[PDB]
Structures are given as C-alpha cells and as structure tokens.
Design a protein around this nucleic acid. Structure first.
Lengths: 316, 315
DNA sequence: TAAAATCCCATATAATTTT
DNA sequence: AAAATCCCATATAATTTT
DNA sequence: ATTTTCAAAATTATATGGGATTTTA
DNA sequence: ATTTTCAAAATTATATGGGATTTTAG
C-alpha cells in the first residue's frame, strides 16, 4: 500500500542502471521516507495530494528542476502500478508550471574578454597556472568534465589533430574510479584540434609527472592527474575552479558569472559556435548531444524581424 | 470487445477533431471492417496478430507511412483499453522490425529546372494564368490551403508582409470552411521578395469576376477558380499534374513526378536551409509546430561536415 | 473540307505525407 | 608564533543535462 | 514518426578535514 | 523537461463526367 517502498518496486525491476543513477534514485527514496506522502496508501493518493507534495519540496528548499524531475520519477513509478493491475488513476500527471513558478536562475556564459581576463589571470598565477592548458582545452572542445578526465594517451591523434571521445572516467564514493561510455549514449565522436588546444595538449603530456599505476577497464595512460598521481575527477576539478574563480574575484572588480564552473566552459564553447552560425546538426555532433532539441536551445528565440532580416541576408 | 468496436469507442471519446481527421478515421474504420483483424475480440489479440495485420496492409498496396500512422491510431485505442480492462498493448512494437520502408525520395527543384519551369509556365497560353501563384509558392513556401485562403486583408504591401492566420479548405458535403489556430503560435508572417511582391500586385489587377462569397468573416479571396469561387488544394493539384505532364513531353531533361504544390514548399525550405539560414528563423517562416521537422531539411553532419564548419568559424 | 482522340475543368474518393 | 586563509582532498546532498 | 519525455546520468553545491601559506599578534 | 508522438490534419492520387481543342483517319 505504501508509496515509499512500492516505489522501490519500480526501481527493483528496472535494475540495470549506472551508479550515479542509483545515488539519485536513493535520494528520492529518502525524500519519500521523510515526507508524509511516503506512508500514504497507494490507492489513497489523489491528484491534490501530489500537488501539495511539490509545494512542500519547494518549501523544503528544492529547486524547480529538481522537483520537476522527481515528479517524472513518481509519475512513472505509479504509471507502472496503473498498468501493473493495481488500483489505477495517476496523481502525478500534471504540469508543474501551474503549481510552482520556474525560478531557475539562468546560467550566463562568459564574454570574449571575460574569458580572456580569466585566462590571463590563470596563465601567470603560479598556483593554478598548472591547470591553464586543461582550461584552454575545455574552451576549444566543449568536453564534459569526465570526458576530459577520461582522456587516455591512446585517445589523441596529433597527426590529424583530432580528439577521439569514446568514454569517460567517473568516480563516486564507494566504487572509486570506473569507466563509462559517454553520456553521448548515441555513440562516439571525434573532435578536431585548433592550433591552440594542440599546443596545450603538447604541454600537458610534457608536464605529466609522477603517474601511479592505474589501469581501469583497459584504460591506463591518462593525461590529467591529481596531486596524488591519480587522474582528475569531476569534483576535484570542480572544487579547484571554486578556489580559482574566488581567487579571481578578489583582484577583479566585476566578478565572473555566478556559475563559472568547468561545465560553464562547455556552455561558452557551444554558445560561441551557435551564435557564429554553425550548422545545428554539425554542432550537435561536436557537442555529443543525443538530442537535437538540446542543441537548438543554444540558438536564440526567433522573431519576424530576425527571420525577415535573415531572409534578406540570404537574398542579397 | 471487438477491434472495430474498440476503434469506434476510441474515436467517439475523442470528438474534438477537424473534418479531415474524421475522414481519416472512417477510412481506417473501413479497413477494420474489411480486414481479418477487426473481427478479433481484444481479449485474444496478440503481438503476432498485430504484425500479421501490418503484413496484409503491405500486400494490399498501402505505403509504410499509411500503415505506421494507422498502427498508431490502433495503438492509441488499446491504451484506452488497458485502463478499463487487458494488461499489455498489441501494437507496442516497431514497424521497421516488421516492414521495410520503401518511401520514395521527395527531391527539391534544382535552380536550373526551376528556372526552366517558370519560363515554360510564363510561356504557354493554357498555364500563364497560374505563373503568379507558383512563383509565390516558391518564394514564400506557403502551404497550398494557406495560399487559397489569402485575401486582401491578409496582405501588407505597405510593409511587404503576408499574414498567415488561417487556411481555406474544401470538402465533399461540407463545402468550403476555414480552420484557425487556437494558439497565436499558428499565426506567422512572411516577407515579400520583389519577385513575390510584384507577383501579388499582378494578381489583384487580374482578379476577375469573383462570385459572391464569405466564410467565417473571410471574403475577397485572391485566388481564382474559373467558376468564380476561390481555388482549392485539389483544384491546384489537378492543374499541376496536367501542367507537369505537358512540360515533360516538351522537355527531355525533366521533371520529377513528386512535383506538386507542397514540392514548392519543400524546395523553398531546402534552398534556404542549405544556404545557411538560421534554424530558429527558418522554423518561424515555415510555420512548423515542431522544430525537428525543420531540421530534416538539414543533412545530418558527418565528422567531415563538422570538419568544415569549424575550420571556417573557429578562428 | 467534316470527321475522330484528348486536353481541360471540376469533383467524389482513396491513399500518402506533414508534423 | 597563532591564527586565520588557502590548497587539496574527501563524503553527502542537491541541480543540471539530455 | 523516432528518440528517455511514463527519469536516467551526468554535474554542481555544501559540509568537514588536516597540512601549507598567509597574515596578524 | 514540454511538444501529437498511444494520430491528428493536412495534401496528393486515382477515377470519372462535361465541354472545349486539336488530334488521326475519311
């Protein structure tokens, strides 16, 4: 009767998932264990009670997107039960836009000189000077942080000047490092090298030092290593950025965008190209976007004037 | 507890549909009455039985898309049936794992044959009439019923703007009617080329002897059937067929058979997409509900295609 | 010279494609 | 020389990506 | 239509720890 | 995540009467 652990039924028979999926799955479970909704009988839950849940999540302090993803998880869990011959009527099929307001504070990319002031700061700052070449690469590839982390020496071709992104190196508490196919589950992609990331990649390998024995799922010779001599992870480069941009903020009047993270580097790269008139399907391949809709979100909303102005551009 | 009865049940509980839709529903309803499947009680329908049906639909002569769309119609009906009892859906499969897709390539007009086409139309006595409409179609990529539905109130020569707010349809029994978008997303505005603007200025002067006509507050339609009433998608299509035929007997090189009013639109979108027009903007002009459709006009990128794009821009 | 095939307009109807 | 502040490293929880 | 759109799977954000500098006493 | 994606809603193809336009055979 519970929804706390009749939700556990859904995830049990949908078992083959990534580790990071198991973590988020557990989060929702403990939310249900904390929330009143958890103990409610499965056939007792009405559409009103589901809406109130969302409100409680926002009062609890969770993000709009966070709650929204949770509605979908709960929508599917019960949706099974509706199809699973248990008492049927789904309370979680509504639009969260009616209940709550989307207060998702947008992520603003860096501007051509904003990033230049950043790079110039780093270039000569002995502490974070070392990470300069990694950052340049992020702005010239649009790699996910774990895809950069996962770059082994076999994944680079300096002849054709091309990066072969075929996997990523993930680490989570408990399992340590592990290997996954890219979140580009659509497949594999090659990313060419401009001259500057090329020069950056050369220096990285040359500056590689003190690499401890480390091979996982057949992958061995990584370029980007921690102080340990072990490869970098997401959280390592993340927290590294948090100190660096803070270091920047102290000496620079205008602060960097609120979420200037490795992830933002990828965002900037894409935004630059999309606003440069790159073929939307060309950019999709490069960004490893499984969905073309995702790639389009980096293109600006169109109006009659913009469309018309464009139409004359191609006319003459 | 019959496939026919079930489909009849489904389409009953969903009546808020336009005329063409209930036409398409009855067409499928006829199939269920005729095909072996329709008699089957939904208690005893299997994934096997569904895939058999599709195989019969292929041998019948029906295209993949017809079968696939009808599959989805029937798939929907079973979704209704699971809730009120039925545990699983017989039509929850992929037609591609049952049927191969022979759907013919809809090829755009090469600028040379497009050029040769217009001069031909401009040339011969019988078809110089519709030169203006055809040029307008090509230079604006309007859907044929959006064209037929155009009136003087929908034009803006004072700023060269075409307001698509509606479409004039015509049907058997029903007659003429107009369908409007509930959302304001359906309204879209198209710029006028000097070619297009002038072409529309030469159709006003030639609109002759119009029969008295107003439908849902829409009157003075620009486009000209010789019986005094506005022309129709069917009335345009038939003419196109005759037009192309006389062209192809005159010309050795030409011309694609899929040539049709919507081929003008398909051509419009292709030449624009290839020339590098912003996808968001191109979606606006085309009036696509889904943005993915616009991108079907963009040839998928290879690593080589990705190679070129960046070597240009990334500097 | 009148005579027969066939282009043409229109439309009911069934199948295909857009999105 | 003592005490903050920083760098690097984690475990845990929430948010963004697709 | 097809594809996750009936959430998976990544990322950032936050809390805690010494040891190394940096900075005040 | 929403968007139709458990088809709606368009357009094109096929077939057939009338009526003008030029065909092949008197």
């Amino acid at each position: 009767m519970t929804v706390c652990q009749l939700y556990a039924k859904q995830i049990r028979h949908r078992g083959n998932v990534k580790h990071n999926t198991k973590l988020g799955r557990e989060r929702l479970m403990r939310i249900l264990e904390q929330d009143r909704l958890g103990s409610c009988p499965i056939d007792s839950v009405k559409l009103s009670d589901a809406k109130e849940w969302a409100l409680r999540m926002k009062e609890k302090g969770l993000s709009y997107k966070t709650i929204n993803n949770d509605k979908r998880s709960l929508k599917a869990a019960f949706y099974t039960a509706i199809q699973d011959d248990c008492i049927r009527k789904n309370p979680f099929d509504f639009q969260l836009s009616d209940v709550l307001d989307d207060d998702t504070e947008p992520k603003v990319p860096l501007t051509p000189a904003q990033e230049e002031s950043f790079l110039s700061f780093i270039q000569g700052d002995k502490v974070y000077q070392k990470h300069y070449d990694a950052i340049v690469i992020l702005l010239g590839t649009g790699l996910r942080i774990s895809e950069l982390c996962g770059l082994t020496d076999k994944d680079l071709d300096f002849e054709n000047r091309v990066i072969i992104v075929s996997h990523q190196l993930l680490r989570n508490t408990g399992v340590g490092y592990y290997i996954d196919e890219p979140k580009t589950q659509s497949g594999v992609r090659k990313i060419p090298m401009n001259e500057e990331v090329y020069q950056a990649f050369q220096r990285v390998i040359k500056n590689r030092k003190g690499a401890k024995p480390f091979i996982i799922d057949g992958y061995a010779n990584f370029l980007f290593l921690k102080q340990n001599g072990y490869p970098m992870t997401a959280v390592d480069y993340g927290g590294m950025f948090g100190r660096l941009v803070k270091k920047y903020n102290k000496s620079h009047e205008e602060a960097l965008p609120k979420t200037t993270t490795p992830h933002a580097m990828r965002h900037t790269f894409c935004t630059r190209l999309a606003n440069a008139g790159m073929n939307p399907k060309a950019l999709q391949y490069i960004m490893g976007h499984s969905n073309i809709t995702m790639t389009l979100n980096f293109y600006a909303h169109a109006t009659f004037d913009s469309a018309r102005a464009e139409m004359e551009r191609l006319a003459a």
